[PDB]
């Protein structure tokens, strides 16, 4: 029982990690666009 | 022993994940505010 709960927890945590990676990539693109905008201005 | 260490590791990792989510949310709000500022300017 303890083992299956741990496996399920890691599975869900990997989904969480994947969402945080998505977020970070979005933010990186957006800050880069702002930096370039200001440079181009 | 191996099992309790793994459970404790996941527990701590979930705390880490929660901190990264906090950070990403903060950053998203801040970049959005900057984007809107520049648009309003």
């Amino acid at each position: 029982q303890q083992q299956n709960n741990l496996l399920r927890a890691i599975e869900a945590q990997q989904h969480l990690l994947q969402l945080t990676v998505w977020g970070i990539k979005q933010l990186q693109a957006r800050i880069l666009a702002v930096e370039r905008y200001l440079k181009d201005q | 022993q191996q099992q309790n260490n793994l459970l404790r590791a996941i527990e701590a990792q979930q705390h880490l994940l929660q901190l990264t989510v906090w950070g990403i949310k903060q950053l998203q709000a801040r970049i959005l505010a900057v984007e809107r500022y520049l648009k309003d300017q």
Partner: peptide
């Protein structure tokens, strides 16, 4: 994917993990 959906899914997975970890605290 949107930020509103991002927040929803984050919350879903977090609550599931909490339940799983607790349910294991009761080894």
């Amino acid at each position: 994917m949107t930020w509103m959906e991002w927040d929803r899914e984050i919350n879903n997975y977090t609550s599931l993990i909490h339940s799983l970890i607790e349910e294991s605290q009761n080894q």
